[PDB]
Design a protein around this nucleic acid. Structure first.
Ligand code: K
Ligand code: K
Ligand code: K
Ligand code: K
Ligand code: K
Ligand code: K
Ligand code: K
Ligand code: K
Ligand code: K
Ligand code: K
Ligand code: K
Ligand code: MG
Ligand code: MG
Ligand code: MG
Ligand code: MG
Ligand code: MG
Ligand code: MG
Ligand code: MG
Ligand code: MG
Ligand code: MG
Ligand code: MG
Ligand code: MG
Ligand code: MG
Ligand code: MG
Ligand code: MG
Ligand code: MG
Ligand code: MG
Ligand code: MG
Ligand code: MG
Ligand code: MG
Ligand code: MG
Ligand code: MG
Ligand code: MG
Ligand code: MG
Ligand code: MG
Ligand code: MG
Ligand code: MG
Ligand code: MG
Ligand code: MG
Ligand code: MG
Lengths: 224, 155, 206
RNA sequence: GGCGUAAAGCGCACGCAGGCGGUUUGUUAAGUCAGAUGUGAAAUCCCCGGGCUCAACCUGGGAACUGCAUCUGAUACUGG
RNA sequence: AAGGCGGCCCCCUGGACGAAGACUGACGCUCAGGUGCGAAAGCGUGGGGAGCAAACAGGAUUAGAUACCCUGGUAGUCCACGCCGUAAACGAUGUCGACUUGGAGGUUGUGCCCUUGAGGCGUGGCUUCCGGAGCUAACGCGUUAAGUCGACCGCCUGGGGA
RNA sequence: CUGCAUGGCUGUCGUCAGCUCGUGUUGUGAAAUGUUGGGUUAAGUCCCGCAACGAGCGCAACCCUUAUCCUUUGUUGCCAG
């Protein structure tokens, strides 16, 4: 990844200069149309640095958890997550996924048990009552934590999209001591993130390139 | 491995339609005796469950302090809501001269000789807060020499 | 509010009776009271033998009493003089001849009668009620019980003001009639008065 | 140590006495600092010792008495 | 400056702000005692008196109703000149000066840009609402600080009595 | 004699829809959240959303009786041919 793919993907476009956060004044090139312009020569080396340490974490066999729950970017994140043998959170982030792992591991046990009885159990004991509810509750479980069903334990890194929409997960990771990799748009604050990457987050092509490159680099992490 | 001290147990209440509902709160501290300290606060309907909650809370929540063979490096001041705390290193053989809530914190910290004094509120919770915050902001000479970029005699 | 007796509300649904004889209204009352006398005996002379249930059954003109017990060796004794010294007096009380059988309860920690007796025996030994209650609950729950709750009441620890203190664990759906609910009661006579103990144990539905 | 609400900002202003005073150079040496001299009685307190069988107690030498006055220097800061 | 100030016109008169310069050269800040100004009610003398309205009278309501409600109604409210010197006289926040991330407005100047409009880019004064750090017992305050500091002044020391 | 020393049993608000806990998180703390919000229900009933995620006692169902039909048996009950 270098400069011009990031321009034509629209990495430089920020939010309006009404809704800016002061702490990211250093990553702001200027303003046109009263729109912040993100600085790109600041983005390239810190992105590369994030990618490097992600690689190293990957080949020491680290579990990585992609986080993006925007309606316009979460299918790209499922795409990228299982394209590179990692884990993802695409629907609502349950407040307490990491700090309260002891309790949500029973939710994933429930998910696993009622999926093994789903169709390689093949009971179809209907009761008059229970297709409508058992199937819908598997749906309810696997859409919100079906991406975390194989993690087993606490992850090794957080990849974040739009740190402000994802403040709960970030603060959880900061308490638990897990590294945070976040794309930081001009309105979010970067202080919970230990590897900052300023870029656009609302457009789908910026997000596509981000997770394409990161999925790649962790695929060749597991390559070693 | 870690030393544990029970500092305070309090009975608190909460009114409902039926009447009053009583609960117990326990404030404890734990330390390794060589510069690591944590404080824990627990609540439960019964006292031993409250104490166990506070100990569990305090085995996490543990900070590092840089001691000088059993005493502070310099006089320090800590502050929390109502509590002001002044601690000062002493010579060998003085013991821990401190109030009731400071004494447990400094005992389980591994400190052996200080002169301390509490001003303002002596609410045990806030006093423990202030003593911890005054210990953590205390700096060793090598970190001062690292700050200033010169490792002169004063170490 | 006041609750229904959880064994009485389940008679004929999932819980059986403790007496299975038939009688017209001619001999019903005397059958009943001689059953009361035999039960009072087989309560009070097998006191420390850990008896949980006494099932009385009356064929045509004679009785058979089945004693459920946790410690069958003492109610069967040393080669068996003791069921003899019991039936020789139960046939004495009920006027008809008698037969005695002895059934074993294999897990005495999953029976409300034995757990209640245990807690009252400890309470009469001057033991702190909290320890009795919590040990009963943890012993019952570590052996596969789906739920338990114990409740003690009345001048706990010699206080002047009586109190009711209960401890629950697991699942006790007293409103479900399918529920396998084993309930029993006991009373401890201490130097400050009577202390009541109630024990509910839930083992499963249907 | 405090003064929005716990006690506590004069109803507001002008202004004498008083307190305080941007920046540069020179000068002075009042404040300040250094040294020295005289004095600060003895006893008491403190240190190192010595005598009562020990201790209290008594006693030798020192230190201290944070002060004042005078003389000689220093000139960064305050004052003229 | 505070108390306060509201049709329009004229006369006399205080302050503030801005632009580009010129001039003096520390002439500054605060201020015990002192002096001045200071809502409404009230007081003195002389006028004026529509409306409103303490006191007062009557009618109701009510157990009673020296009140709330209704019908009347005097001082006062208005003017001139004196006195009084108090208010939840409040931002319950003394004056002056310096420093410390932001956002949206109001009002009043001024500079530049195709002045192309009721356009865009700057720079001063005053002012309103959010809110970051920090502070606070909390509530909250938050470049108009209750943040970080300096100079001077006023005041407080448990509740009643007071 | 003392229900104002107690056990057991009962009335009552009230068959009203509520009352709590574990872990997590927020607050110096009592505490809060969950349990609030938009709909819906007889119902904390259910669905969405949500710093909460789950669980327990309650609600509902399981029990008895009444309302329709079928199978079996047929006296002491029944009488169509
Ligand atoms: K004018
Ligand atoms: K004055
Ligand atoms: K009138
Ligand atoms: K009345
Ligand atoms: K008049
Ligand atoms: K006002
Ligand atoms: K609070
Ligand atoms: K003043
Ligand atoms: K007094
Ligand atoms: K009773
Ligand atoms: K909780
Ligand atoms: Mg004070
Ligand atoms: Mg007041
Ligand atoms: Mg006050
Ligand atoms: Mg004022
Ligand atoms: Mg005054
Ligand atoms: Mg003056
Ligand atoms: Mg003066
Ligand atoms: Mg000067
Ligand atoms: Mg002067
Ligand atoms: Mg001099
Ligand atoms: Mg000697
Ligand atoms: Mg000078
Ligand atoms: Mg007037
Ligand atoms: Mg007048
Ligand atoms: Mg007049
Ligand atoms: Mg009137
Ligand atoms: Mg008068
Ligand atoms: Mg006048
Ligand atoms: Mg006054
Ligand atoms: Mg006013
Ligand atoms: Mg005042
Ligand atoms: Mg102010
Ligand atoms: Mg002035
Ligand atoms: Mg604010
Ligand atoms: Mg007084
Ligand atoms: Mg509730
Ligand atoms: Mg709530
Ligand atoms: Mg429910
Ligand atoms: Mg909810």
């Amino acid at each position: 990844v270098s400069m011009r793919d990031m321009l034509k993907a629209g990495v430089h476009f920020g939010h309006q200069t009404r809704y800016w956060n002061p702490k990211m004044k250093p990553f702001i090139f200027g303003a046109r149309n009263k729109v912040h312009i993100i600085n790109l020569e600041k983005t390239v080396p810190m992105f590369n640095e994030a990618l490097a340490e992600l690689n190293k974490i990957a080949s020491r066999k680290g579990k990585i958890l992609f986080v993006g729950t925007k309606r316009a970017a979460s299918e790209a994140v499922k795409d990228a997550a299982l394209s590179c043998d990692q884990f993802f959170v695409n629907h609502r982030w349950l407040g307490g996924m990491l700090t309260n792992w002891k309790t949500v591991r029973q939710s994933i046990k429930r998910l696993k048990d009622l999926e093994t009885q789903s169709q390689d159990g093949t009971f179809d004991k209907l009761t008059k009552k229970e297709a409508l509810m058992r199937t819908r509750e598997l749906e309810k479980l696997e859409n919100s934590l079906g991406g975390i069903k194989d993690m087993g334990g606490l992850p090794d890194a957080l990849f974040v999209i739009d740190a402000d929409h994802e403040h709960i997960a970030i603060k959880e990771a900061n308490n638990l001591g897990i590294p945070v990799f976040a794309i930081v748009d001009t309105n979010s604050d970067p202080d919970g993130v230990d590897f900052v990457i300023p870029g656009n987050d609302d457009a789908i092509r910026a997000v596509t390139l981000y997770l394409g490159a990161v999925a790649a680099t962790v695929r060749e992490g597991r390559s070693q | 491995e870690l030393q544990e001290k029970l500092i305070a147990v309090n009975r608190v209440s909460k009114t409902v339609k039926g009447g009053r509902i009583f609960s117990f709160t326990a404030l404890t501290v734990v330390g390794d005796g060589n510069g690591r300290v944590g404080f824990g606060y627990g609540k439960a309907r019964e006292v031993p469950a409250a104490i166990q909650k506070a100990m569990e809370k305090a085995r996490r929540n543990m900070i590092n302090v840089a001691l000088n063979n059993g005493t502070l490096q310099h006089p320090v001041k800590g502050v929390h809501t109502g509590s002001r705390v002044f601690m000062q290193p002493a010579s060998e053989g003085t013991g821990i001269i401190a109030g009731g809530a400071m004494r447990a914190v400094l005992e389980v910290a591994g400190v052996h000789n200080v002169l301390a004094k509490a001003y303002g509120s002596t609410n045990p919770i806030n006093v423990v807060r202030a003593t911890i915050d005054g210990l953590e902001n205390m700096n060793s000479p090598e970190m001062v020499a690292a700050k200033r970029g010169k490792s002169v005699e004063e170490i | 509010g006041q609750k229904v007796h959880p064994n009485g509300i389940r008679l004929g649904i999932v819980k059986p009776w403790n007496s299975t004889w038939f009688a017209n209204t001619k001999e019903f009352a005397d059958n009943l009271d001689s059953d009361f006398k035999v039960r009072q005996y087989l309560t009070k002379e097998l006191a420390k033998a850990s008896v949980s249930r006494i099932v009385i059954e009356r064929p045509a003109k004679s009785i058979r009493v089945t004693i459920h017990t946790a410690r069958p060796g003492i109610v069967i004794g040393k080669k068996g003089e003791d069921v003899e010294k019991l039936r020789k007096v139960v046939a004495d009380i009920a006027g008809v001849p008698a037969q005695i059988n002895i059934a074993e309860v294999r897990k005495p920690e999953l029976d409300a009668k034995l757990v209640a007796d245990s807690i009252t025996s400890q309470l009469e030994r001057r033991v702190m009620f909290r320890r009795a209650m919590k040990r009963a609950v943890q012993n019952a729950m570590r052996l596969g019980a789906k739920g338990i709750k114990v409740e003690v009441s009345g001048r706990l620890g010699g206080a002047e003001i009586a109190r009711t203190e209960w401890y629950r664990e697991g699942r006790v759906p007293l409103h479900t009639l399918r529920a396998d609910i084993d309930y029993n009661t006991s009373e401890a006579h201490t130097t400050y008065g009577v202390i009541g103990v109630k024990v509910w144990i839930f083992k499963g539905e249907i």
